[PDB]
Paper text:
Here, we present and characterize a panel of nanobodies that can be used to functionalize designed proteins built using CC dimers such as protein origami. The nanobodies were selected to bind to different CC modules representing the edges of the designed tetrahedral protein. The crystal structures of five complexes consisting of CC dimers and nanobodies show that the nanobodies bind primarily to the noninteracting sites of the CC dimers and, in addition to complementarity determining region 3 (CDR) loops, strongly rely on the nanobody framework residues for binding. The most extensively characterized protein origami cage, tetrahedron TET12SN, self-assembles from a single 461 amino acid residue polypeptide chain consisting of 12 CC dimer-forming modules adopting antiparallel or parallel orientations (APH2, BCR2, GCN2, P3-P4, P5-P6, and P7-P8).
The P5-P6 is a representative from the designed set of orthogonal parallel heterodimeric CC peptide pairs. In the crystal structure of the [name]-P5-P6 complex, the asymmetric unit contains one molecule of [name] in complex with P5-P6 and two additional free [name] molecules involved in the crystal contacts. The structure of the P5-P6 peptide dimer agrees with the proposed design and comprises four heptads with an NINI pattern at position a, which together with the pattern LLLL at position d form the hydrophobic seam of the P5-P6 dimer. [name] interacts with both chains of the P5-P6 dimer, mainly with the residues closer to the C terminus of P5-P6. The CDR2 loop contains a stretch of Ala residues which, together with W33 on CDR1, create hydrophobic contacts with the core residues at positions a and d. Additional interactions by CDR1 include a cation-pi interaction with K20e and a hydrogen bond with Q23b. The arginine R100 on the CDR3 loop is involved in a network of interactions with several residues on both P5 and P6 chains (N16a, Q11c’, and E15g’). Finally, non-CDR residues on β-strands C’ and C” and the C”D loop contribute to binding. Compared with other nanobodies, the binding affinity of [name], measured for the tetrahedral protein TET12SN, is rather weak, Kd = 21 µM, while the affinity for the isolated P5-P6 peptide is likely even lower and could not be reliably determined using ITC.
Author numbering: 3 to 115
Write the structure that this text describes.
Amino acid sequence: QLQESGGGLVQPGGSLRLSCAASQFTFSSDWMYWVRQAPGKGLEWVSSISPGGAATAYAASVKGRFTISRDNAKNTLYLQMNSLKSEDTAVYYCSKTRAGTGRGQGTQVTVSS
């Protein structure tokens, strides 16, 4: 089980920090991902993080302004998002695959304004 949180209403150029709590003890050995779904669009990969945190990857549209990180002792995944724009508006999910299978209920980021 996974539970995203931290979403909200923000102004263009603002920022938010998303959190994702994982209930299974397997979190420490899992690749984890942030994916998002904007209005009327499909799921889109945002970023990826290796089990130990040593390898990360980012969609080109968020490179340099988003940071994925994880705390395995707290079984929590994080996403720090900066310089948010209206096109960043979406439901954000954490997932165990880049395609978004095994996601929580998501948390909505709304940017307008």
